[PDB]
């Protein structure tokens, strides 16, 4: 998976940032959380929101 | 069953009569069909040109029309021959 500060690609299809890149900020270590990973972005969506929570199978790592 | 994968389609697409047949016979038949179509068209053109043979649609002949219809047959046969050759037949 990612770590803090990793650059990932969103694989969720209904996300605003599908096929788009961005930076992991916090990964919740508690596995009861379904979407443990805070990923931040530099471009806003239609509701002017800059971040979102994701699962580990929904993000890809770029290098 | 019809859907196919790879470079060439299976023999079954040609039909029951065509699949059984060898590539060589099909190619020869296609060439014959092509020859018949061209000759018939040329003959029809000559008849159209000729005086006393073109009046009141007299130029049209049943056999020449059959050859003209046969041009499409020549194309199909050649395609079938290629498929047969591909299926090692």
């Amino acid at each position: 998976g990612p770590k803090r500060g990793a650059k990932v690609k969103i694989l969720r299809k209904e996300s605003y940032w599908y096929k788009g890149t961005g930076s992991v900020v916090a990964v919740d270590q508690d596995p009861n959380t379904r979407y443990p990973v805070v990923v931040r972005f530099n471009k806003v969506n239609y509701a002017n929101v800059s971040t979102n929570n994701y699962a580990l199978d929904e993000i890809q790592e770029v290098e | 069953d019809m859907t196919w994968e790879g470079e060439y389609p299976p023999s079954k697409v040609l039909g029951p009569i065509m699949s059984k047949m060898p590539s060589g016979l099909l190619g020869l038949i296609s060439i014959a069909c092509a020859a018949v179509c061209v000759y018939s068209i040329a003959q029809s053109g000559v008849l159209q040109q000729q005086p006393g043979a073109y009046e009141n649609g007299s130029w049209v002949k049943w056999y020449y029309v059959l050859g003209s219809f046969g041009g499409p047959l020549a194309w199909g046969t050649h395609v079938a021959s290629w498929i047969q050759r591909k299926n090692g037949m």
Binding site: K9, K13, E14, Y16, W17, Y18, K19, G20 | -
Partner: protein, 162 residues
Amino acid sequence: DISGLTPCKESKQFAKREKQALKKLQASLKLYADDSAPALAIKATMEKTKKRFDNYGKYGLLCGSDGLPHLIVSGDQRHWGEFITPGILFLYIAGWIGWVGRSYLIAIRDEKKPTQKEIIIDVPLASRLLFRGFSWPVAAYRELLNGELVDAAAAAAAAAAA
């Protein structure tokens, strides 16, 4: 000629248009005294008008039965000055702008605030970029066969459908 058109130097109706356009300005000229500003302005207008008809007569344009010039865009090389030669000219200037403007966005993208430099232009940087588009057909061609012109399919966001 093409479409049953006649050249403008040999059109009887193109010549009548020239006369009636001059007659209209002469009948307006007669109401003024010869040294005054309205008489010098209309005299200069009839020179401009007379030079406009002379220019077309030798131009090599085609006229119709209406007496007006027509343009041929089949691709004939004999009527190139009508569409091809001003066409190649526009393509050079339009592709120059699009190329230069794109260079700017790509340049200020790698930055803290790219949006700041789109409302408030970095002019020294912009001025430099504007004149580098004089050889764009070579620069747009180097990036096509590099990989830096078009992005990959996994980099564009797409609507849920596809």
